[PDB]
Write a protein that binds this ligand. Sequence first.
Ligand code: BCL
Ligand code: BCL
Ligand code: BCL
Ligand SMILES: CC[C@H]1c2cc3[nH]c4c(c3C)C(=O)[C@H](C(=O)OC)c4c3nc(cc4[nH]c(cc(n2)[C@@H]1C)c(C(C)=O)c4C)[C@@H](C)[C@@H]3CCC(=O)OC/C=C(\C)CCC[C@H](C)CCC[C@H](C)CCCC(C)C
Ligand SMILES: CC[C@H]1c2cc3[nH]c4c(c3C)C(=O)[C@H](C(=O)OC)c4c3nc(cc4[nH]c(cc(n2)[C@@H]1C)c(C(C)=O)c4C)[C@@H](C)[C@@H]3CCC(=O)OC/C=C(\C)CCC[C@H](C)CCC[C@H](C)CCCC(C)C
Ligand SMILES: CC[C@H]1c2cc3[nH]c4c(c3C)C(=O)[C@H](C(=O)OC)c4c3nc(cc4[nH]c(cc(n2)[C@@H]1C)c(C(C)=O)c4C)[C@@H](C)[C@@H]3CCC(=O)OC/C=C(\C)CCC[C@H](C)CCC[C@H](C)CCCC(C)C
Ligand SMILES: COC(C)(C)C/C=C/C(C)=C/C=C/C(C)=C/C=C/C(C)=C\C=C\C=C(C)\C=C\C=C(/C)CC/C=C(\C)CCC=C(C)C
Ligand SMILES: [Cl-]
Ligand SMILES: [Fe+3]
Lengths: 281, 236, 302
Amino acid sequence: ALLSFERKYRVPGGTLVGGNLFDFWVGPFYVGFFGVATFFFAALGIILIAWSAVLQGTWNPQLISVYPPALEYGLGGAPLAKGGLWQIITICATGAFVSWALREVEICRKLGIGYHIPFAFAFAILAYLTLVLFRPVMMGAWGYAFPYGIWTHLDWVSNTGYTYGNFHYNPAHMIAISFFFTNALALALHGALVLSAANPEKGKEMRTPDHEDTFFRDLVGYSIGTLGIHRLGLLLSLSAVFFSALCMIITGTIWFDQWVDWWQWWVKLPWWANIPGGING
Amino acid sequence: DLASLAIYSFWIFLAGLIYYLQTENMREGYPLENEDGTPAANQGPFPLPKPKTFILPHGRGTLTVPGPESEDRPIALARTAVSEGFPHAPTGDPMKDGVGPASWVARRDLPELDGHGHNKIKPMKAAAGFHVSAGKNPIGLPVRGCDLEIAGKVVDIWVDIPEQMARFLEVELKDGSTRLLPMQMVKVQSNRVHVNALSSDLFAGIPTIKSPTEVTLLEEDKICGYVAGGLMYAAP
Amino acid sequence: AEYQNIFSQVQVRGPADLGMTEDVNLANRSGVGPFSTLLGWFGNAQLGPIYLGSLGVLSLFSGLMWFFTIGIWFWYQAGWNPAVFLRDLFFFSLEPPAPEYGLSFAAPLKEGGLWLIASFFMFVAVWSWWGRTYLRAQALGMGKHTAWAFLSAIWLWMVLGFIRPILMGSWSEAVPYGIFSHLDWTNNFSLVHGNLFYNPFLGLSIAFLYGSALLFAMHGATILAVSRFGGERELEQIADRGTAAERAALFWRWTMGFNATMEGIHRWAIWMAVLVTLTGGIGILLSGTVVDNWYVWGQNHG
Ligand code: BCL
Ligand code: BCL
Ligand code: BCL
Ligand SMILES: CC[C@H]1c2cc3[nH]c4c(c3C)C(=O)[C@H](C(=O)OC)c4c3nc(cc4[nH]c(cc(n2)[C@@H]1C)c(C(C)=O)c4C)[C@@H](C)[C@@H]3CCC(=O)OC/C=C(\C)CCC[C@H](C)CCC[C@H](C)CCCC(C)C
Ligand SMILES: CC[C@H]1c2cc3[nH]c4c(c3C)C(=O)[C@H](C(=O)OC)c4c3nc(cc4[nH]c(cc(n2)[C@@H]1C)c(C(C)=O)c4C)[C@@H](C)[C@@H]3CCC(=O)OC/C=C(\C)CCC[C@H](C)CCC[C@H](C)CCCC(C)C
Ligand SMILES: CC[C@H]1c2cc3[nH]c4c(c3C)C(=O)[C@H](C(=O)OC)c4c3nc(cc4[nH]c(cc(n2)[C@@H]1C)c(C(C)=O)c4C)[C@@H](C)[C@@H]3CCC(=O)OC/C=C(\C)CCC[C@H](C)CCC[C@H](C)CCCC(C)C
Ligand SMILES: COC(C)(C)C/C=C/C(C)=C/C=C/C(C)=C/C=C/C(C)=C\C=C\C=C(C)\C=C\C=C(/C)CC/C=C(\C)CCC=C(C)C
Ligand SMILES: [Cl-]
Ligand SMILES: [Fe+3]
């Protein structure tokens, strides 16, 4: 049940709520007040989903799908069978995510390390909240949120995207994709670098961070460093999700026309707006 | 059809890959133990991987993992419950005993060497060419504790030469002796260096180093573990 | 306010680092460049030196040729008017030869000829740079991890503009050199193939793309969380585990039930990333060559 070097860290303290009432582990899992909180929200939410499965007539994972209330209902309550379960489950989901982050904070205090992880996680929770709460409220109806279903939610993406033409033209969607692409590139390099140093040519001796820095300067003429690479990855990640939430928060709110047309502000600038020739003339 | 073949093959591949990956991450901390240091009943579904050996860079030897694990230090802790799963309370001074958030591990009592075999970290006074090139220079600044009391003043910066980076601040205490403070735990302000993790009466407890011009992996761990433990233990 | 260690609070400089010498031909390393105080706040302040061997120049040369080839065409299209050039910058496009010419090389310049030229320059620029990546690791005695990972990305690239266009029978099947162009091509490729979301490989590819961000966010944050115990010196923590490696692992064990090792986490990292383009290349390679409609295929797998 314990890692060879674990006992020394399993000391009392660090809890945010309830003192030492829930200060304990179950197997490897820590259980704070929030350990209990998330279980409560998750059990409930899984129950409501099972119950929504019956009302629908399937027990097939590829088929089950909880839909939000129809547009007619605007931002109000709705019958369980027609958008209500979705609303309650959304609350439970939100309760389960926020609790998990808070539980991570408590684990951070007991171990005496920084709070970067719970902090990073918050960005994901935020993207989720933009889709099921922020955008819908700003648009006037819970009907704009995505349905909870393995394929039905991809339908939402597809349809919502095509509602504004080729979504590729959303400018904030371009930034977002760039960060996602870049973060993967960066992750591939970081993992390969450290590994090629710890596992040098057959029989040779373990390389050093000096070699790591050398390899990169040789290659591209610059090395961000061991501390820099981790600051970078964290940043590329959080930025990718930040621009994602952002490209959506503006779609259907301050901009509801074709995204491709948004680009005329540039082509139609006074100066070149009239010159003949080119693609736009 | 071909596509069906491809995707099915892939899932089998992916299962082997995850197996490999998981066993590879068991080269440390395993096998599992009971709260009493005894080998746990079930170790899970994955078996320990076949040992691998690292050839350390400067005649410093060999490393083989997985291998016999053992806290090569005493642990001043005592059970608080009659069953597995509960906190273990410190029997003495958690800070002084090195437990909980103030824990340290028995790393080699040697210093880390750069690619050429030289001490990776040196006081800046002994590193020719090095100087503060940007940001407030902390040297000469008084250091304050979480209790808003002054506990000393910075007298030097220990730097990472191959990575040209600040790692510790050498601080002189009223008794005339010095201690190292990790760079990541201090706040450099315009007219002073602030340290939250510790209160003024705790700087003296900070572990001290053998040689005045070098730190060993073992000493870094005791120093850092100590000041991080203050967050919890210095709290009052 | 507690210190987060996202930006350094004090910068420290010393003499330029000429770097490790191994079986490296020091004759091919340039001189150090200036020091950036700006970059210094985030990572290393030192720029250069860089190693330029024969392959580097080869790669770097054809790399510009490819770039310039496309650029004169964009200018040809802009009527050499620097105003137009800028206005319609994202609209220009060097398209591949018409489907008429198939996999031939007899297409006239203003009809796909330049495309072939440019593609050829790109072909050697990328492959020579791949070789560069391998030799640079050999000269320092390091493993070839970077070369094998880079090969994964090359895979998707090879499928998009080479392998698939050949199995289909025409260079018209390839991707055009243009900004908005290749965006339309993408949207279009999906439509023509029955909606790419029904392709199981796009789905895996997405999973790993999202996984790469999940992981790096997790990893970067963890290391910064334990940098107060010198967590970033990952190599020494691998040889002599410290408290940084222990609390890092324990944080994740107490959170999700399992953990990794200082070395192990990097094996997770290289594969999560590599699988994005590995899974993706297969998905695209099978599109149009073996499967014509993913919706249909999905209806009865086969
Ligand atoms: C995978 C499916 C599609 C595809 C779909 C998309 C989609 C969808 C989007 C892009 C976008 C981009 N694509 Mg693409 N793209 C494909 C294949 C390519 C090929 C090559 C295959 O072999 C390349 C080089 C590119 C390159 C690019 C970039 C120009 C741009 C993303 C920036 C980035 O962070 O890149 C990651 C790489 C790095 C960080 C390292 C190298 C530095 C890069 C090249 C810097 C580019 C700067 C850019 C030109 C600046 C414009 C602003 C200036 C003021 C004019 N694509 C395939 C065919 N691509 C995004 C965009 O904004 O497009 C307009 C976008 O939304
Ligand atoms: C055909 C449709 C359109 C299109 C329509 C859309 C639409 C519509 C949306 C996106 C969004 C995104 N698109 Mg798009 N997109 C298109 C084409 C592309 C292409 C391409 C190469 O062609 C690319 C790279 C992208 C890329 C992207 C991403 C930048 C972004 C989604 C990531 C995200 O927000 O994560 C954020 C992460 C989350 C929301 C997850 C949060 C996780 C939560 C907190 C935890 C869950 C825990 C779970 C329940 C626990 C399980 C426990 C078990 C024990 C495991 N798109 C086409 C042109 N795209 C989305 C976006 O920007 O969203 C904000 C979005 O809404
Ligand atoms: C970001 C923009 C869109 C979106 C666009 C897409 C697109 C496009 C695709 C997916 C795909 C997936 N999406 Mg999504 N998805 C969105 C929001 C969510 C939310 C949420 C709480 O908001 C969740 C749980 C999911 C979950 C999922 C997975 C079922 C599947 C991806 C595997 C993966 O590796 O993911 C990355 C995460 C990890 C690698 C970490 C491990 C987490 C595991 C995989 C989670 C499993 C969840 C399980 C299936 C659901 C349990 C729910 C029960 C009630 C407990 N999405 C938003 C609305 N999603 C892919 C697919 O194949 O779909 C069929 C796909 O192509
Ligand atoms: C910069 C943001 C990036 C990021 C970071 C991130 N994710 C994180 C963390 C961090 C730093 C964690 O610490 C945390 C973790 O512990 O990971 C192991 C986590 C995590 N990221 C996760 C998923 C995840 N992250 C994603 C993305 C990202 N995570 C970003 C790329 C995605 C995508 C791209 O889709 C997913 C699926 C979880 C595995 C894990 C958090 C687990 C958690 O909070 O668990 C407790 C919650 C439950 C048990 C909830 C169940 C509730 C009910 C059963 C109802 C379900 C409702 C839901 C709406 C159904 C959806 C169905 C779908 C088919 C649509
Ligand atoms: C797992 C797959 C992921 C991945 C991995 C990956 N990429 C890699 C590697 C790896 C492992 C490398 O080793 C390699 C590298 O060297 O990285 C630093 C690389 C690389 N990934 C690159 C790009 C890239 N990767 C991408 C993606 C991905 N890479 C995936 C997410 C993308 C996207 C998202 O589309 C792009 C654009 C390259 C930057 C780089 C390989 C460089 C290369 O092939 O170069 C040939 C050289 C040229 C074309 C030189 C000319 C360049 C410019 C056109 C001119 C302007 C600059 C020039 C310096 C000016 C000179 C002026 C003179 C007057 C002096
Ligand atoms: C409307 C269009 C639909 C679509 C299409 C689509 N997606 C695609 C493709 C296509 C046609 C791919 O080919 C690609 C793929 O691999 O698919 C299997 C992909 C993909 N879609 C993804 C995600 C995705 N797609 C989505 C959607 C859609 N994709 C739409 C439904 C979504 C959502 C949320 O809706 C997501 C998250 C990725 C997993 C994957 C794409 C590839 C990727 O991220 O690649 C990075 C790597 C490369 C492009 C590597 C080649 C690198 C070269 C070797 C380097 C270039 C060299 C040059 C010298 C650089 C010079 C730089 C200068 C600055 C110097
Ligand atoms: C400022 O003005 C100057 C003149 C200085 C420069 C101007 C240039 C500009 C402004 C250039 C802009 C270029 C842009 C925006 C290019 C964008 C390219 C993009 C977005 C995508 C590229 C996709 C291409 C991939 C899929 C290509 C793959 C190619 C291959 C695999 C090679 C295939 C090779 C072939 C067919 C022939 C060679 C044959 C062999 C095997 C020997
Ligand atoms: Cl020398
Ligand atoms: Fe790392």
